Structure formats: C-alpha cells, structure tokens
Amino acid sequence: QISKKKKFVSDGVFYAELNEMLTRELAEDGYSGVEVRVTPMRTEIIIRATRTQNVLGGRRIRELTSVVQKRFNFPENGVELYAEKVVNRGLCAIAQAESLRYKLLGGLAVRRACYGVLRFVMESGAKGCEVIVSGKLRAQRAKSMKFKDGYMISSGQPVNEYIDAAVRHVLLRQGVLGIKVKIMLDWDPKGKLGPTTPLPDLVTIHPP
C-alpha cells in the first residue's frame, strides 16, 4: 500500500490541480475556491462561485463530478461535487480579481473599473482595500499604479490571515496586465466575515 507521506503529497498536488483546472473553466462564473472532505465512503468536493445560477446550468455539475471520478481514477459512487454561492462576493479577493479582469476586458476604462471594484469592496464592509495594476496601459512604457485606502497592514504573522489577496495576469490586446487585489478583514468572533481572532494591536476594554 501507499505510505502516509506520499499520500499527503498526492492529495496536496491533487487539490492544486483541481484548483487550477476549475479556475481556468469558470471564468464566465467566477470560481472562488473549493472545499474537499473525506467522509466514510464519500469524497465531497464542493466548488464555490460568485455566480451560482450559471454553474448549475444541474447536468453540467454531474459531468464535472464524473470528471474527478474518471480522470483521477476515483471510485464511482464515492465522489460528489456540487456548486455553492459566495457568502460575500466583495470580501473575496479572487472574486474581485476576475471581476476587474472581466470589467477591463469588456471595454470599460481600467481606472473606472478599479474605482467600481473599490466601492464594491467597501460595500461589502472591508476594513481596507488595495488594487495595484502594473504594465502598459496606453503607452509603450510600463507603469505601476495603485489605489489603496482603509486599514492596510504589511508585515508579520497577521498578514497571512487578516488579509485576502489575489493576483491575475489578464491577457489584453497589447500584452499582459498584472492585477493584484488585497482586502483587509475585520475581527468577526463568529468567523463568517474574516478571521476568528482579534489583531495584536486591537484590544477591547470592559467598562468598569
């Protein structure tokens, strides 16, 4: 049989492969991650999307369920795959990443597209946002242009759970434009908004 180390590596690279495969197919719907669990006799793989009414089309979901069953040599009647709706479209980094990609590809000016995305993320309720676009916008020379506001931490352990970041390489007519979106999440003790723990610099006081 297969040792634990090789199996763990195999599931890790398999999840990465699943993410890459799904992110390059749901461009019309905004793929926003996946949750994979292993229940007795069942392997559940639930896809996330900002737009879910179009993922269902539910026959196509059954085809994509057979996709992992037969491509990865998974056993039949042991793998399930459904689609799910984002709790908050704005608070999701990749959601606004490909949203900005679609907005700039459609024909909107990039500046206006990032202003719209920036207003939408504060509509969601983000502590702060940052959008960085690098490359050639109109001229031959490439430039880096940023729009940031709100709370924007930059260092330490809290950077890897109190922020959500996404990077994309949109193929434009004249080249490839690099987009990055970073969103700060507030302290939600329940954990539905962002992290379940407060920041080290955030301290609350009970009145006497």
Tell which one of 156, 175, 189, 191 touches RNA (CB under 7 A): 156
Considering only the stretches 69-77, 90-98, 155-163, 165-173, report the one whose residues sit in contact with RNA under the rule CB under 7 A.
Answer: 155-163
Tell which one of 3, 5, 107, 205 touches another protein (CB under 8 A): 5
CB of 6 to RNA, least distance (A): 7
Report the candidate in 150, 141, 158 with the shortest Cα–Cα distance to residue 181. 150
Considering only the stretches 91-99, 114-122, 174-182, 193-201, report the one whose residues sit in contact with RNA under the rule CB under 7 A.
Answer: 193-201
Q: Does 5 bind RNA (CB under 7 A)?
A: yes
Q: Residue 46 touches which of RNA, another protein, none (CB < 5 to 8 A by kind)?
A: none
Q: Does 154 bind another protein (CB under 8 A)?
A: no
Tell which one of 3, 39, 77, 204 touches RNA (CB under 7 A): 3
